[PDB]
Design a protein around this ligand. Structure first.
Ligand SMILES: *[C@@H]1O[C@H](CO)[C@@H](O[C@@H]2O[C@H](CO)[C@@H](O)[C@H](O)[C@H]2NC(C)=O)[C@H](O)[C@H]1NC(C)=O
Ligand SMILES: *[C@@H]1O[C@H](CO)[C@@H](O[C@@H]2O[C@H](CO)[C@@H](O)[C@H](O)[C@H]2NC(C)=O)[C@H](O)[C@H]1NC(C)=O
Ligand SMILES: *[C@@H]1O[C@H](CO)[C@@H](O[C@@H]2O[C@H](CO)[C@@H](O)[C@H](O)[C@H]2NC(C)=O)[C@H](O)[C@H]1NC(C)=O
Ligand SMILES: *[C@@H]1O[C@H](CO)[C@@H](O)[C@H](O)[C@H]1NC(C)=O
Ligand SMILES: *[C@@H]1O[C@H](CO)[C@@H](O)[C@H](O)[C@H]1NC(C)=O
Ligand SMILES: *[C@@H]1O[C@H](CO)[C@@H](O)[C@H](O)[C@H]1NC(C)=O
Ligand SMILES: *[C@@H]1O[C@H](CO)[C@@H](O)[C@H](O)[C@H]1NC(C)=O
Ligand SMILES: *[C@@H]1O[C@H](CO)[C@@H](O)[C@H](O)[C@H]1NC(C)=O
Ligand SMILES: *[C@@H]1O[C@H](CO)[C@@H](O)[C@H](O)[C@H]1NC(C)=O
Ligand SMILES: *[C@@H]1O[C@H](CO)[C@@H](O)[C@H](O)[C@H]1NC(C)=O
Ligand SMILES: *[C@@H]1O[C@H](CO)[C@@H](O)[C@H](O)[C@H]1NC(C)=O
Ligand SMILES: *[C@@H]1O[C@H](CO)[C@@H](O)[C@H](O)[C@H]1NC(C)=O
Ligand SMILES: *[C@@H]1O[C@H](CO)[C@@H](O)[C@H](O)[C@H]1NC(C)=O
Ligand SMILES: *[C@@H]1O[C@H](CO)[C@@H](O)[C@H](O)[C@H]1NC(C)=O
Ligand SMILES: *[C@@H]1O[C@H](CO)[C@@H](O)[C@H](O)[C@H]1NC(C)=O
Ligand SMILES: *[C@@H]1O[C@H](CO)[C@@H](O)[C@H](O)[C@H]1NC(C)=O
Ligand SMILES: *[C@@H]1O[C@H](CO)[C@@H](O)[C@H](O)[C@H]1NC(C)=O
Ligand SMILES: *[C@@H]1O[C@H](CO)[C@@H](O)[C@H](O)[C@H]1NC(C)=O
Ligand SMILES: *[C@@H]1O[C@H](CO)[C@@H](O)[C@H](O)[C@H]1NC(C)=O
Ligand SMILES: *[C@@H]1O[C@H](CO)[C@@H](O)[C@H](O)[C@H]1NC(C)=O
Ligand SMILES: *[C@@H]1O[C@H](CO)[C@@H](O)[C@H](O)[C@H]1NC(C)=O
Lengths: 487, 487, 486
């Protein structure tokens, strides 16, 4: 006729996604991305990190060098994987402050061991046990030297070794606690006092405790594992009258990106930075709900099973009408656009610049959230198999506090960002609407349903000029004014 | 007259509330709710949590079986409330890691004790002390067995108890430290000794220390309390030559929701999810400022004394003027509405759909904040009476860090939620204004004071349609245009 | 011309600052302020906190009374500064929980020492060492009494010291660990033994461990340092057969604002609340990147080297365009303003009320961020010279968690405040535009670039009336309608 209808609107999808916001908990959007990694590959990836498979060994067993760990001598790792099927198959032993030695070795990142010419004069070296079978013969820990009497004599040892290198030396040693007095006399030829291992900086004094223990692998005795770190310029001094499980040398202490993880997952052929006890995970998402123990460039752990970030706007599912009444399910070329009813027929076109502006802002948001990872290697233990008390309670409290704070941050971030995304895309729809209103000047009226009523004959070329920003309102001003106001 | 005025606006109150926002610290709102629970009932509510009243007992005193704790034997609790007037009136004891045992048992949640038939031979059982009286006779702890010599001999005990059940067993035992050597010879007929309690996984060795102590209840001697946890399939082996305060059995270890709290509040008939040492508190508010220690489904502790969440718009108290100039004290039916001037007279009506939309958004926000609590059962100690050093400093650092972070989160959350509340209620007022503008089309002009001047004769029927919606601008369009655009 | 052009706009600068927002991490603004203190003065200000310069003394050496530390006796501090050049010149010693004793003394805030009439009968007092030279004489720690023996006898000392005052008493004592049995007999006349120090509530029992150790200052023996806290109403019993490095009295324990810091910076004659190991820092900014170790009213430590807070608007660089197309680089009188073209000529003026409203809201934000810092005195150790185990790992984990969470909060806060500031100044431009539209009513049209076309004669008096809100649309309505329509 003499008028045309130009409706502005946006696309819609048949099946949207439900996201959370500040105003609402369940708002439907056209599209959303998962920000919580809730699955793993089931396998640990061996690249870029050097992964040392513990097999039947724990890290401490590999440190001491019991027979099943012979293949772990002088090895390095980025992450040591300890299996729950791992077991000791050697002399029974314990480590006072086990967790500290395990953390120290895990953070050292190597079992590189240099033998030293210790002056073990007057004692018999290389003691053996039936509990440690190396190659069908009795043996002992490969990195320890079980000293016993020589010719029924064990003289008081005072053996020193300067640290003349530029690095710290880690010495692993222990105390043998025999089952009975007959074993103390049989092995050391005398009752024992104390063993003192010292440096200039510090000293450790320990005592044997002769007495029966419940048998593990048919041995009623125990070895207690102790360690010392010797700084450059410092001197190790071992003062012992018996019951000394001597070092054969030193381990290297290194600073680095190494740690230890407990996992039953197989190790595959891969390239994945983030390792969890359930296997490696992608680190594209900013958060994860796989596990709380992590290694490498990992997402933050949260308790939410899902957090969906709106990478799109509110769906608003289902004459012509604009964005105020409904979204358009028939629009697939873009996010925002125009639909019109003209004397030449009905039609539709996408507005690609507003679509790209909204997409660019969403891409900015994703670039701020996606791809930014938390690269962490050595942390505290987060699952415990024994109840010790105050220290474990504090470690659990710290981890629970961290998880509650990061879960709060993730929930607030997702709700604020989703509210921002809806306000952003409604804002972009409004910028296109005000731009069209300003371009049309007095030649059209807002009908209140997201559409403009154009009061002049506006053909397809006219509509196209409006869509791409080249509409000249002066050409049609008299016709539209004469039609709006009955001159 | 030939024209009418329709002013849009919002309600106001004589006395508002001062809240914080992003750009304004002292912004007045019509209504706000307190988000910090800063008061308590002064009593601990005994439901739904099972609460065991310590009376004159500590949890440890109840654990060993102090004469004042006969009412605690084999009992369960969800929260043990330890009293500051509690004291021991039995043999004085020293638990070398008191906090760990107190926490371990508090989280275990029961004093269930099975009297296992320990094979004590060659010794005298059921030793008593004059400092621990039951029914006017000398007694001892009911869960400990003080072993002494029999016929002036104390043979070396070697007593084995395998763990043949499916749960862990907690054995509590100790070492007697007499005040002098005469006491040790009188009780044990041994100059000294060593006590070793072993499992397959770990061992504890303790030595008695003969010497004087300050007399507590006239006793110059001490009992050192130790505990062993025996896993299923593990074995308890006790080896002693003297000074053994023997176990009478085991306590059960359970994973659960139990804990210990220090408080002096009375216990009475009530119902409250969250327990605080100042008495139980309502858990409706998201935050609290009562005490650092909590139990159950509680709000999170912050340093803020008050944080008020706006549950209404900005209060701007003060011809007809609208939301641009002031708020309306005479609007009592709703939050948003209309006032009009026509030839019939002046009037006012509330717009209930905009009011309900704003209320629904606020109620959604309240559902996000109010009623959502965090269940916290066993945590670290958060108040200390003794100066311990590094571990206490770390616990204080962790708790103050948590509180500082949650106080920041509370301040940012309240400022963001109040800024959003103001923006949302101003947005709803602006949406009603734009909606009215759209219905009026060319039949009205914005007066710049929140009011529309309607340029057709408009008397109580057109105003009704405008308030309802679906106002027909076409019928009045020629009259309004003749009044607006004629010279 | 029968019309006039009235354009609205905002100022711009030739060179702006790059800030981060929620949806744009490289957005240029007219002005910004640094919220991360990234540099120190290099000196530790001696005011308002009382600071003791350790020089060659550690806190433990000051506690025990090392001969070089005589100047620290009975002194008080709000912050003790331990130097990396510090070393001992007395008997070698080992504190089995060094960090805990150092924390107790640092938090007590004083070395006020009170001598007590201990009954050290039957033994010789005031033992000396060649490693502790005080006045060119052999000496010992001034707060410890090295008891050896009297006439080749060491009767078992059973010494009681009641606490009859209202404060906790800190007693520092030790155990000598000689390098050989001959030294044990020479000093104490009898071998082995043990030392028990106890109160009503607690007890500590230790044993000497005779044996050679690596020589420090040509001495192969060690003194172990132990301590006990005696509450009011309690009694301290020291029971020793030998090897006792006895107390001479007690140290007072106070609750307060004292702590210890490791630093090599000199002490300056200045005033600053926040002290870091690199020296004092200003405490105006909400965050810092100088050090993790803090004392006083400090900002929070973050991982960011810089965080810039927009204190301005978008710097949109460039007949009259308006705010939608670009900013106005020629504006010096304000942030928001007007430009016009009329029958007399072109001109420009600032709108000071919109400018002040935007500035007042920005100052509100600055008042919430700047000047609000957090006073902390005694915290965990955050740097370590040796690796100890799970406790050090936990302390590092806790501090790193705090830093990551505050760094997250700092980035979220800066991005939200900068996005709000941009929305704020865009909103103020929009309220000024809408306000102008409302005064003009139907006498002007929005031409789409931030300008209004006014369809009536509007001289400089008219433009001024529009600027200050006195414009009356009724008097110009017939001319503007005749020119605007037909
Ligand atoms: C203390 O008791 C334990 C167990 O009751 C004894 O250990 C047992 O020794 C026998 C010796 O033939 C072994 O067959 C068992 O397997 C051992 N069991 C356990 C649990 O260790 C131990 O020998 C006893 N000690 C003394 C000195 O009599
Ligand atoms: C070591 O000295 C203490 C002094 O405290 C003696 O303990 C006091 O003994 C008397 C009499 O037995 C009591 O009246 C006091 O109450 C005790 N003191 C305290 C603080 O309780 C202790 O007897 C002495 N030891 C020896 C072996 O003589
Ligand atoms: C234990 O061995 C150490 C190491 O040789 C002895 O200490 C040395 O003693 C000589 C004696 O003049 C000194 O010159 C050295 O400087 C000492 N070296 C160190 C590292 O301390 C120590 O004397 C020996 N102890 C016994 C009892 O034989
Ligand atoms: C959602 O976005 C992703 C990534 O851009 C795209 O692959 C997917 O097809 C989108 N889905 C819908 C329904 O728009
Ligand atoms: C680990 O031990 C099991 C038996 O427990 C054995 O079958 C397996 O071969 C061992 N694996 C390696 C790598 O030695
Ligand atoms: C002990 O065994 C080690 C194995 O490396 C060997 O080098 C050393 O010579 C042996 N010493 C004695 C005394 O058998
Ligand atoms: C362990 O029991 C045996 C039994 O003969 C005894 O000789 C030994 O001294 C005991 N050890 C301890 C530490 O009690
Ligand atoms: C240390 O070695 C010396 C060497 O003479 C000896 O006399 C002393 O008994 C030893 N001490 C210990 C605890 O081994
Ligand atoms: C990962 O393993 C832990 C082991 O306790 C389990 O609780 C968790 O559900 C697992 N997660 C996934 C995604 O497999
Ligand atoms: C805009 O569209 C019209 C009609 O389709 C066309 O004539 C004109 O060249 C277009 N201009 C631009 C800049 O794309
Ligand atoms: C504030 O809201 C509460 C309901 O939560 C209502 O009871 C109270 O009357 C309101 N007060 C004002 C001043 O609006
Ligand atoms: C606790 O002590 C008070 C002291 O007055 C006494 O009345 C009460 O009976 C005691 N209760 C128990 C359980 O010992
Ligand atoms: C020791 O006392 C307990 C009390 O329960 C009793 O059952 C046990 O038979 C007594 N044993 C002896 C040897 O008196
Ligand atoms: C609750 O009790 C604690 C006890 O330390 C006290 O510090 C706090 O002020 C009390 N709070 C209230 C609200 O009574
Ligand atoms: C419109 O509002 C008026 C208010 O006076 C009311 O009387 C009338 O029933 C309403 N009509 C409809 C259709 O809502
Ligand atoms: C930025 O603001 C500061 C005051 O905070 C002022 O001194 C400085 O001149 C301003 N710079 C610019 C370019 O506006
Ligand atoms: C610190 O020690 C050095 C090296 O012995 C000495 O030169 C200096 O004078 C000492 N300073 C003080 C204050 O004791
Ligand atoms: C020991 O030295 C102190 C000075 O610190 C002195 O007061 C005391 O009288 C001396 N005692 C003896 C027994 O010489
Ligand atoms: C405790 O004091 C008495 C008092 O003579 C003494 O006999 C005993 O040996 C002392 N014990 C210790 C460990 O000092
Ligand atoms: C402060 O000192 C620490 C430790 O020496 C150093 O890592 C840091 O870079 C220093 N910072 C500044 C701003 O000097
Ligand atoms: C506004 O500006 C005009 C400029 O002509 C002046 O005459 C008038 O007095 C001013 N009014 C106010 C309130 O500043």
């Amino acid at each position: 006729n003499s008028t045309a209808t130009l409706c502005l609107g946006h696309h819609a999808v048949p099946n949207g996604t439900i996201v959370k916001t500040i105003t609402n908990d369940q708002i439907e959007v056209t599209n959303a991305t998962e920000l919580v990694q809730s699955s793993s590959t089931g396998e640990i990836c061996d690249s870029p990190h050097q992964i040392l498979d513990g097999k039947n060994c724990t890290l401490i067993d590999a440190l001491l060098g019991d027979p099943q760990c012979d293949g772990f001598q002088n090895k390095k790792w980025d992450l040591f994987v300890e299996r729950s099927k791992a077991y000791s198959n050697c002399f029974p032993y314990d480590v006072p402050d086990y967790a500290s030695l395990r953390s120290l070795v895990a953070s050292s990142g190597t079992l590189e061991f240099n033998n030293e010419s210790f002056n073990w004069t007057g004692v018999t070296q290389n003691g053996t046990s039936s509990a440690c079978i190396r190659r069908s013969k009795n043996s002992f820990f490969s990195r320890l030297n079980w000293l016993t009497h020589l010719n029924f004599k064990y003289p008081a040892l005072n053996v020193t070794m300067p640290n003349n290198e530029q690095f710290d030396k880690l010495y692993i040693w222990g105390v043998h606690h025999p089952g009975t007095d007959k074993d103390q006399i049989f092995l050391y030829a005398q009752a024992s006092g104390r063993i003192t291992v010292s440096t200039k900086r510090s000293q450790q004094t320990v005592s044997p405790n002769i007495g029966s223990r419940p048998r593990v692998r048919n041995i009623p005795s125990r070895i207690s594992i102790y360690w010392t770190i010797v700084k450059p310029g410092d001197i190790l001094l071992i003062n012992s009258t018996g019951n000394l499980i001597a070092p054969r040398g030193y381990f290297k202490i290194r600073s680095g990106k190494s740690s230890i993880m407990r996992s039953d997952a197989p190790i595959g052929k891969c390239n994945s930075e983030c390792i969890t006890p359930n296997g490696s995970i992608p680190n594209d998402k900013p958060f994860q709900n796989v596990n709380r123990i992590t290694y490498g460039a990992c997402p933050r752990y949260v308790k939410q099973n899902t957090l969906k970030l709106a990478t799109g706007m509110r769906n608003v599912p289902e004459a012509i009408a604009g964005f105020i009444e409904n979204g358009w399910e028939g629009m697939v070329d873009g996010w925002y656009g125009f639909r019109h009813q003209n004397s030449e027929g009905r039609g539709q076109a996408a507005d690609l610049k507003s679509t790209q502006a909204a997409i660019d802002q969403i891409n900015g948001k994703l670039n701020r959230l996606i791809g930014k990872t938390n690269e962490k290697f050595h942390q505290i233990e987060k699952e415990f198999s024994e109840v010790e008390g105050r220290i474990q309670d504090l470690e659990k409290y710290v981890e629970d506090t961290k998880i509650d704070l990061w879960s709060y941050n993730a929930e607030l971030l997702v709700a604020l960002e989703n509210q921002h995304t809806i306000d952003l895309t409604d804002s972009e729809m409004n910028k296109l609407f005000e731009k069209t209103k300003k371009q049309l000047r007095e030649n059209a009226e807002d009908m209140g349903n997201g559409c403009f009523k154009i009061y002049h004959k506006c053909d397809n070329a006219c509509i196209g000029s409006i869509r791409n920003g080249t509409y000249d309102h002066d050409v049609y001003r008299d016709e539209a004014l004469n039609n709006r106001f009955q001159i």
